[PDB]
């Protein structure tokens, strides 16, 4: 199971904390799952290689300061923009044991 608050609320210009705690997680991914246009990967916290934000968020996406791992797949969406508002979804792909995913909402 993945632990994520259903709703996350960030005021403008704040580092919204996207939570994704698994109960070891090999990799976490976050994406913006909203619609055809709003179907974009946001960041990939791969445990062995680090965070790899996507081209449109390389600056507004960063993981919490050490040491939050293990099993913490949190990523903070700072300087949140009114547009950022939208449902996201974690995928915690726990290995040596399988796969998962959880939705979320951010309401800026």
């Amino acid at each position, epitope marked *: 199971e993945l632990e994520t608050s259903d709703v996350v609320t960030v005021v403008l210009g704040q580092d919204a904390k996207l939570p994704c705690f698994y109960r070891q997680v090999g*990799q976490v991914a976050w*994406a913006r799952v909203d619609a055809g246009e709003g179907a974009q*990967e946001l960041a*990939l916290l791969h445990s062995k290689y680090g965070l790899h934000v996507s*081209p*449109a968020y390389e600056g507004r996406v960063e993981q919490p300061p050490p040491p939050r791992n293990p099993l913490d797949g949190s990523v903070l969406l700072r300087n949140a923009v009114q547009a950022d508002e939208g449902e996201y979804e974690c995928r915690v792909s726990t290995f040596p044991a399988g*796969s998962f995913q959880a939705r979320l909402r951010l309401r800026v």
Partner: antibody
Amino acid sequence: EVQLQESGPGLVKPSETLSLTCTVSGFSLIDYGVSWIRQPPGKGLEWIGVIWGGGKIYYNSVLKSRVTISKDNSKSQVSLKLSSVTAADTAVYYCAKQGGLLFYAMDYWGQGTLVTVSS
Amino acid sequence: DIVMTQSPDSLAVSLGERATINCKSSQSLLNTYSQKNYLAWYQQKPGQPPKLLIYFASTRESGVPDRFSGSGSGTDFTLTISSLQAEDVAVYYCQQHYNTPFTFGGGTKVEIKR
């Protein structure tokens, strides 16, 4: 060492389903992503979809509703299945490895395969 | 869907001369936060799979000779093969790798005036 081999049926009856396969080798399909591009003979490249190492699949809007990418991390195999293959689906299909984790420029490519929808 | 429009469609240049293959995007390929522009130039020579040349508009890729000096920003970008030695007679495609669905442009076929 990063080698992608694309093998599939070549001649497909109209209204059928192509089913090429891309045997990746030398890179862990668990970490890197592979996408499928096609290039209609004598035309521009087209994107079909990307299967990121975690199994999230992104498809082009146009060929969607008619495509399916999947992989087997175990056998280093990625596969394309396009439904209702029709006149326009004739092309050289390509599988390329995404350059890096969540990087959208396809650094390594496959040689290609001409699927020919025909009667 | 970012629309990438290369221009011109076809280009003829002598061996020594500069080539420029402009490319345009309905959407900017710029991350202000990162100050990176994400546009990649490929090189589909006759009968071969496309080969990336320049990611990040400017950053080339190991092996790509310096003649291929890519540049540009926003929605206006540009490839420049400084001296079009003959082998560089392929079709060059600009791809936006800013987001999905990746989109390539038409391709500017370059040629040589002997």
